[PDB]
Amino acid sequence: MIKLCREVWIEVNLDAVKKNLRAIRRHIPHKSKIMAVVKANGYGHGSIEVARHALEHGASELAVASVEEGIVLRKAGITAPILVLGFTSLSCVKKSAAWNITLSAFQVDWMKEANEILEKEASANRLAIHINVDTGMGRLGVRTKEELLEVVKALKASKFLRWTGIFTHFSTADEPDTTLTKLQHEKFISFLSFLKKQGIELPTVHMCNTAAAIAFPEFSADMIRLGIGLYGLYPSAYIKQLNLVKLEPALSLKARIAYVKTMRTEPRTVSYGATYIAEPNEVIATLPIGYADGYSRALSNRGFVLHRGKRVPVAGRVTMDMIMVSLGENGEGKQGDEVVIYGKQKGAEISVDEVAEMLNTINYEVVSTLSRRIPRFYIRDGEIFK
Amino acid sequence: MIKLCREVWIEVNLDAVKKNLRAIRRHIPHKSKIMAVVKANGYGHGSIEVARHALEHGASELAVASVEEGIVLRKAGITAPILVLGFTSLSCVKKSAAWNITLSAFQVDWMKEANEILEKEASANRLAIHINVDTGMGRLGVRTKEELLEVVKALKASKFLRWTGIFTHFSTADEPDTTLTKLQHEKFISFLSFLKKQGIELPTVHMCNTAAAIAFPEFSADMIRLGIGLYGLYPSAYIKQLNLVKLEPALSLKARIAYVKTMRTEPRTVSYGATYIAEPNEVIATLPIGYADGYSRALSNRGFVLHRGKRVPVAGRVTMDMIMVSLGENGEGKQGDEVVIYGKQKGAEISVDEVAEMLNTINYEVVSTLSRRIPRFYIRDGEIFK
Ligand SMILES: *Cc1c(COP(=O)(O)O)cnc(C)c1O
Ligand SMILES: *Cc1c(COP(=O)(O)O)cnc(C)c1O
Numbered sequence: 001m002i003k004l005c006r007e008v009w010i011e012v013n014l015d016a017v018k019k020n021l022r023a024i025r026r027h028i029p030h031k032s033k034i035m036a037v038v039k040a041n042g043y044g045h046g047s048i049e050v051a052r053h054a055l056e057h058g059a060s061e062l063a064v065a066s067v068e069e070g071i072v073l074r075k076a077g078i079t080a081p082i083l084v085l086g087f088t089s090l091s092c093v094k095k096s097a098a099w100n101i102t103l104s105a106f107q108v109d110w111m112k113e114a115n116e117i118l119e120k121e122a123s124a125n126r127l128a129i130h131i132n133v134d135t136g137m138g139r140l141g142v143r144t145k146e147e148l149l150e151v152v153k154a155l156k157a158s159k160f161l162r163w164t165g166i167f168t169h170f171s172t173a174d175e176p177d178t179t180l181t182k183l184q185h186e187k188f189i190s191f192l193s194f195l196k197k198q199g200i201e202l203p204t205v206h207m208c209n210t211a212a213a214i215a216f217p218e219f220s221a222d223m224i225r226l227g228i229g230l231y232g233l234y235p236s237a238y239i240k241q242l243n244l245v246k247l248e249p250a251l252s253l254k255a256r257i258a259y260v261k262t263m264r265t266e267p268r269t270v271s272y273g274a275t276y277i278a279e280p281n282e283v284i285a286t287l288p289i290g291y292a293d294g295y296s297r298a299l300s301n302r303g304f305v306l307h308r309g310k311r312v313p314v315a316g317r318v319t320m321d322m323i324m325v326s327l328g329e330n331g332e333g334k335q336g337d338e339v340v341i342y343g344k345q346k347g348a349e350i351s352v353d354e355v356a357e358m359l360n361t362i363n364y365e366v367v368s369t370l371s372r373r374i375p376r377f378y379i380r381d382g383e384i385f386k
Numbered sequence: 387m388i389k390l391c392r393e394v395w396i397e398v399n400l401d402a403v404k405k406n407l408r409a410i411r412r413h414i415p416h417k418s419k420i421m422a423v424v425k426a427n428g429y430g431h432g433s434i435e436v437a438r439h440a441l442e443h444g445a446s447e448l449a450v451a452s453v454e455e456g457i458v459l460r461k462a463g464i465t466a467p468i469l470v471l472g473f474t475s476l477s478c479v480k481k482s483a484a485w486n487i488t489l490s491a492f493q494v495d496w497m498k499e500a501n502e503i504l505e506k507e508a509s510a511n512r513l514a515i516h517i518n519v520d521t522g523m524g525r526l527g528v529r530t531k532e533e534l535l536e537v538v539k540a541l542k543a544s545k546f547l548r549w550t551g552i553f554t555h556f557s558t559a560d561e562p563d564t565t566l567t568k569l570q571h572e573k574f575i576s577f578l579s580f581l582k583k584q585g586i587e588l589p590t591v592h593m594c595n596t597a598a599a600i601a602f603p604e605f606s607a608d609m610i611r612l613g614i615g616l617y618g619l620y621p622s623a624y625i626k627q628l629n630l631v632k633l634e635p636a637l638s639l640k641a642r643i644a645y646v647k648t649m650r651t652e653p654r655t656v657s658y659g660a661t662y663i664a665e666p667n668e669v670i671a672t673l674p675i676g677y678a679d680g681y682s683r684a685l686s687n688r689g690f691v692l693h694r695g696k697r698v699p700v701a702g703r704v705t706m707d708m709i710m711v712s713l714g715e716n717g718e719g720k721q722g723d724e725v726v727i728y729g730k731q732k733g734a735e736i737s738v739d740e741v742a743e744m745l746n747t748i749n750y751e752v753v754s755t756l757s758r759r760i761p762r763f764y765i766r767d768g769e770i771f772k
């Protein structure tokens with residue numbers, strides 16, 4: 001199959017990504033664009049190949065966490081609009097314009113000072129901007145309709161800026177109680193109505209994350225922001241249970257057994273702390289993944305991997321680079337056998353969602369903390385590359 | 387002051403690393419060498435520059451998790467011996483000899499097949515090998531005297547290989563009960579005098595990790611493997627409290643406030659889940675760090691940062707890229723102010739070790755999971771460089 005020195009790797013199924021984009025496309029209104037959210041290295045799936053695939057199969061724009069993530073995509077030959085969701089220091093204004101990155105901003109002072117930096121360097125390449133309106137996320141963005149007006153005016157007065165969007169972020173659209181979500185929607189529409197009544201024409205409006213796209217597709221407006229769903233993962237249990245859109249998981253994480261041994265002699269202590277004592281004929285397979293790869297140490301004596309289609313448990317503590325599992329009394333297994341850490345094997349499955357449940361977190365965290373040291377392979381039209 | 391687009395960075399104090407190395411050197415026997423452990427991107431501090439500094443200031447070899455980690459060091463100009471502590475596939479044997487990386491092995495069959503690959507290439511480089519003995523870690527390594535002996539003869543007979551060392555690993559040396567650690571010591575020594583009685587001359591003998599170097603410096607033999615200590619962190623509260631060796635923590639994690647706001651208008655909800663509701667005169671600051679950087683989401687309504695010399699609470703949930711914090715009623719804080727996330731500022735400190743206690747994990751995980759997206763800056767002779 002694949003040749004590696006250390007035998008741990010991720011497979012991202014781009015056929016799955018395409019199918020997710022199509023399922024979402026067919027769910028939200030026909031005219032709505034998709035902005036594929038490829039922040040944090042593609043939610044740990046690899047920003048570039050996900051971005052490239054997304055753009056060919058129904059996305060129009062990309063979103064990222066920073067200018068540096070956006071430049072990564074440029075250097076990969078990507079020319080679609082890239083929006084930085086977080087805050088960008090005035091330090092990087094010039095660099096942003098040069099690499100044609102779209103920045104979010106929401107403050108008069110920032111817009112004017114951005115304009116002055118660009119006026120000095122004199123480039124014809126204007127800096128693209130979106131305005132973030134905070135309707136209750138409480139994170140970034142402007143909060144009253146009157147400060148919003150000033151921001152718009154300052155942006156429109158700035159000839160080295162170009163306004164290409166305005167947005168908000170829902171903070172509870174994945175929850176069974178939709179009260180807050182509807183209050184946010186109705187505040188955002190409100191602020192926009194206010195702008196329209198001052199004779200201001202709107203650029204691209206966008207508010208839905210995956211959760212709201214699915215539960216409130218009527219909010220898609222000109223463009224949705226598809227993150228977790230792109231990766232074939234649901235924003236919550238609730239959203240999944242609505243059974244409105246069929247997503248398929250794009251990531252699996254795999255490895256090969258590095259060493260197998262029957263624990264014939266003493267001491268039969270396994271791993272740091274000696275927290276697991278194996279039986280005399282207990283078989284113990286060692287695997288090349290650990291907590292510095294993003295495989296939580298809280299999975300010590302708790303997690304489960306797949307080997308020849310069955311669940312075999314983590315025995316003893318997770319270490320920095322390796323774990324051990326029990327194949328049981330006289331269990332069969334060889335050096336080189338393929339193991340799935342996240343995903344499917346035969347008819348068994350250990351989803352990223354089950355892993356997040358074990359660890360009292362969410363699927364976003366389990367994928368987006370997968371270390372860059374784990375190489376990514378991509379599957380397209382059923383076959384593997386770079 | 388540092389310029390960045392997104393204002394989050396690590397500083398690694400190489401003056402601290404030099405002192406830790408000195409403190410360890412002065413505590414273990416004069417003739418013992420130090421192998422600096424820089425696996426996992428230097429325990430998230432950056433392997434290249436820690437390794438570079440270490441080799442100028444007490445270390446004479448390095449250890450890594452994998453061939454690929456070793457090749458990163460070699461490309462940066464590093465020439466010292468580099469040991470792979472984990473298992474390496476026979477597919478990487480020609481490569482490892484080309485780049486002069488030292489491989490761990492402990493299997494007769496592996497020895498022969500590696501010799502055989504080189505033999506075919508008429509290789510003029512000999513691949514350097516260390517033998518892992520498993521004395522109770524139960525991870526990797528050979529477990530009996532008798533298997534040990536055959537492994538040695540295979541390797542001695544394999545003339546495109548070169549035996550340059552032999553080790554074991556302690557699994558409990560950071561615990562107040564030393565019983566198992568003394569049994570592993572004793573078992574290792576017995577395995578090694580068993581070899582000597584067949585007239586086998588031994589290469590470099592190494593057993594101690596940071597914990598064993600500090601509590602059992604008499605076990606240093608020819609070489610120790612200094613990991614966590616090199617970074618200025620103790621392996622456990624017990625080891626620290628022994629008060630034997632003073633270590634200085636090398637890493638701090640910083641950011642600048644992306645935005646500061648007073649929560650005047652409704653709704654006053656902060657972050658995903660609306661789990662925190664601010665007071666009307668309460669100041670919320672947003673920071674450009676979140677769980678994809680390795681800032682655990684389990685800090686959501688729990689973590690602390692330092693700002694102007696004091697402890698300010700995380701408010702609401704950690705997000706993928708950003709956290710929010712409370713500067714309290716009528717706050718005092720601006721955009722651009724510097725915040726310490728891990729580390730010290732004026733009176734105050736939030737140590738890696740206290741973050742680890744809160745998350746019920748260990749300092750190793752806390753630093754080794756710091757994402758590569760956070761740029762690392764180094765301090766050397768009081769001054770800063772990238
Ligand atoms: C990351 C992000 C998204 C995409 O969210 P999902 O829950 O992944 O669909 C949307 N909007 C903002 C403001 C974000 O930071
Ligand atoms: C990482 C590692 C070390 C060093 O351990 P610290 O607790 O970091 O000093 C030693 N030996 C082996 C076999 C390792 O994998």
Ligand SMILES: [Cl-]
Nearest residue numbers: 137139140169
């Ligand atoms: Cl936001």
Ligand SMILES: [Cl-]
Nearest residue numbers: 371372757758
């Ligand atoms: Cl990483």
Ligand SMILES: [Cl-]
Nearest residue numbers: 523525526555
């Ligand atoms: Cl080991």
Ligand SMILES: [Mg+2]
Nearest residue numbers: 296369682755
């Ligand atoms: Mg983690």
